[PDB]
Amino acid sequence: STSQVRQNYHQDSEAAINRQINLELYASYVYLSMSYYFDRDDVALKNFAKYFLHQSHEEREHAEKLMKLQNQRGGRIFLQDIQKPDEDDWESGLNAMEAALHLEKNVNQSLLELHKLAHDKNDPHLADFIETHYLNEQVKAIKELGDHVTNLRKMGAPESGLAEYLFDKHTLGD
Amino acid sequence: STSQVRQNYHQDSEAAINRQINLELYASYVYLSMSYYFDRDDVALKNFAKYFLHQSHEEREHAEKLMKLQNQRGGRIFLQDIQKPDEDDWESGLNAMEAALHLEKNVNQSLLELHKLAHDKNDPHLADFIETHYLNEQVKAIKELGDHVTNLRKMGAPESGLAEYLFDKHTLGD
Amino acid sequence: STSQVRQNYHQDSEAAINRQINLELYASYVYLSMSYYFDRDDVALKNFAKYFLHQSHEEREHAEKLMKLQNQRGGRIFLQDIQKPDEDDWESGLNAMEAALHLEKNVNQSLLELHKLAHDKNDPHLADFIETHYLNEQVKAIKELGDHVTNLRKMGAPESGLAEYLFDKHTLGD
Amino acid sequence: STSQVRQNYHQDSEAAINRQINLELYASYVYLSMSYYFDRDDVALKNFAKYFLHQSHEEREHAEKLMKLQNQRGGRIFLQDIQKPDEDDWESGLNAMEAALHLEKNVNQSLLELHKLAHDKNDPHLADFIETHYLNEQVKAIKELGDHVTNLRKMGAPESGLAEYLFDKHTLGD
Amino acid sequence: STSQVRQNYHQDSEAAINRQINLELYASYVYLSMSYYFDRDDVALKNFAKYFLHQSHEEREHAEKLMKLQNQRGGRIFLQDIQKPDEDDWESGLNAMEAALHLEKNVNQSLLELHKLAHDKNDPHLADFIETHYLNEQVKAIKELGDHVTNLRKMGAPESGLAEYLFDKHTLGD
Amino acid sequence: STSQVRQNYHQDSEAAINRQINLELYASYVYLSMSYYFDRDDVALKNFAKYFLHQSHEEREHAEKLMKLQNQRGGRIFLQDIQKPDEDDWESGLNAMEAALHLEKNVNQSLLELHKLAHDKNDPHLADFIETHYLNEQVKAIKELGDHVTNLRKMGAPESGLAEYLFDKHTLGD
Ligand SMILES: O=C(NO)c1cccc(C(=O)NO)c1
Ligand code: NA
Ligand code: NI
Ligand code: NI
Ligand code: NI
Ligand code: NI
Ligand code: NI
Ligand code: NI
Ligand code: NI
Ligand code: NI
Ligand code: NI
Ligand code: NI
Ligand code: NI
16 A cells, blocks of 8 residues: 655656665675675785775665665665675785676666666656765766776786785775 | 846746745745644644744745746746635644645645656756755655654544644654 | 633734734735845845845744734634735835835834724733834834935935945945 | 684684674664664654664674684685565564564574584684673673563553554653 | 776767867856956956956866766866957956856856756766756856846946946955 | 056067967966876876876966966957867876976976066066066976986886886875
């Protein structure tokens, strides 16, 4: 039955929100995984570790914000298993940043579709929500991961252990 | 003829804005009536009274900024009578909360139609204005009014005079 | 059913307070209309606009204190339509000052009749309420508007656009 | 191979830790779900929502500290799917508290087994890690949940909606 | 080649940002020119000069944020000559204000066309970027220049040198 | 005809100043281009980017000071097109530094000629202006650009991607 607050909220929108929530939780799990990889005693890049833990916590916020949205519009929250990440070993700082970059473009793609749907269903409140809270966040995150990938490459990563050490100190360590 | 500032601002949009101003002033008036209803010596719920007086002054502000937008775009303000509310006696705390929820959804619907007009006339400025200053304010009012209605019901209102009293104290009073 | 608080409160008085409520709300509306007339890109006198918006919120307070009075004596508030103002275009700073003067003398005339009624019904609390919160406010307001009208006339308004500009800057702007 | 730091760390412990990590993430997920149940417009108990959201974030911390422990001892983290919680709809404040109480005792169960493993493998660093950061935390949580359940039942929950409202305000609302 | 960050960014959009970049710099150049026209000893209106120098620096910021956008989305900046302004002598305060109004309406028109392109290529990030940072800024700037034009005209500009002097003091000089 | 302030100010000097204004605007433009080159996701050297953006805003100040000197002496400002820079793509940190040095030596050459023109025309006011505000600024910039080029070379640039990264961090990052 229909929530007392529901208005102009398409059940397709509601289902897409539930999928986005699962995708943000998944992204935060991937970042959690990347963070404790660089915490390993045989990798030991503390700033990669805390860079990725920070992203892990932001993705958890992203998801909670979609959960609040769902309830605000009178949709109903249906959670699904959070799939484990594709890797347990992320190989290098470089490779981790690249996998993060790919992850973010896939999150961005699902959000752009969410936005298209909201536009298509004449749900301007939801479109504006995706614009305000998610779209520029992806663009900034993707632009930053590219910069990082670019620098690690020009420095000689992953072959230069020096390059990853120094990028950990001078870029990811403030 | 036309204002020196007018640009990409359709006369249909100008008319809808004059319509929305009136509806916002109307909403203010309803909330004013509600507020002083709970100020009656035979109703005597100060925090209900305070809550709707606050929404009354908010709606007045909603109206004033639509008047500002009107002049900004070079449209022209035509005011209309402000219609008296549907009731002089709002019956109870629960009933007033329910009428308020109904009122906001009707205002929300008016705003969503205004937004699709702005997008049909390819007026991205007007569309963003509505997104930015109205759409999420309506979603929040509607979700809050929903929450209040739910709690007042679960508590035993409107039959239970104890329920409305305790809601007035513990939810609407800080 | 007579209110448990009602005492020495005549229904003529009760009815006349409801009329005065409506009249203050009307005065508020007129002032609102004048304010955004001067916000127009082709009128553009910011301190005229500010001045009348201030008067508008004052009149709203005037109306709210009368609704409070009604409930304090155990009368019952009945709201009526709020008529739109007489003009959509107010022509000039001078002309709006003069309509304000005339509006304020009309509200004063109604308040003097309200007070006459309270005294004829031996209602000294009501007469003192009107004396304390309304009569000198009107006299001050009428005196200020006449001062403003007088200076605008001597400066050459409304034919001198220079005059209305300089008045807006030096008298209505701090 | 074998990590340069590994010392007295049995592969059964390492694998028991990996399973605990998953169980803490699971517990986090359950609490997240409970939290936004109470945020629904038709449930609308915001301090229940606040309380479970805070437990959710605490369990994510339990999980991260185990991931740290694993790396400290030279184990290797292997994450698994995080299973979706057993309900989408938690029925009431009282039922949520009872479910949470059941969840915490099960987590307590797995930790005391984790701990008896550590004593048996003569891993005293691991046993005190469990003693110090988990065992008393679980006892406090189980006791607090017991107290809440006890109080909700005496107040008349889950049938008395008044009871859950007042418990939300006077216990969970600080 | 395609940038590693590019996603949902159409080459027409990329091309149109490059044009908008050039147009803002052009606008900044026009304002620079207007500003030092009022610095001339035979014009000598220092608040006119400060007013246009300020808009000049704002327009340069408009251009720089567009260059930032281009790189954020993976586009490539291509700069073009900056055309000199249409006049070397701007004639009067009023005439400069009117040229500024027409300039800002042209930049607005190009910005609306940029936004419609973003909408048509389903590029919600770019459209939101234009909504957020440019469209209301244009509307405010157009509205203000219109106000200034109106006040200069009512005061007797540009024949009244007294008028432009008094307007420079009381409106543009804080 | 002649400005009422003009004195000992040769028409050739007035024209040379108009030329120098353009060249300063040109220098500004080159540095702006360089700046956002290093802001590209595939270049990604923020301190290079910030460094040239700073020089860009300084050149703009250099230009405006000359526009002010022009009016101070009763000459008349004539703006010309600002020519786009010679490159859209500046290749590397070392190459941009070398271009910048070349640009500055060319600007210095223009200024030294402007100075000798001033001394040939017996304009001690113009000659001291160039001395006081440009000549040593040019020498300091040329010396500093020289120092940067030397270090990037000794470090292994532009081959070494590590070189430019470490320089960006330790020299241009304070
Ligand atoms: O310490 C123990 N319980 O407290 C314990 C448990 C299992 C085995 C052994 C053992 O091998 N003793 O020799 C000891
Ligand atoms: Na928007
Ligand atoms: Ni995200
Ligand atoms: Ni409203
Ligand atoms: Ni209480
Ligand atoms: Ni009044
Ligand atoms: Ni008498
Ligand atoms: Ni735990
Ligand atoms: Ni033992
Ligand atoms: Ni601009
Ligand atoms: Ni569309
Ligand atoms: Ni220079
Ligand atoms: Ni270093």
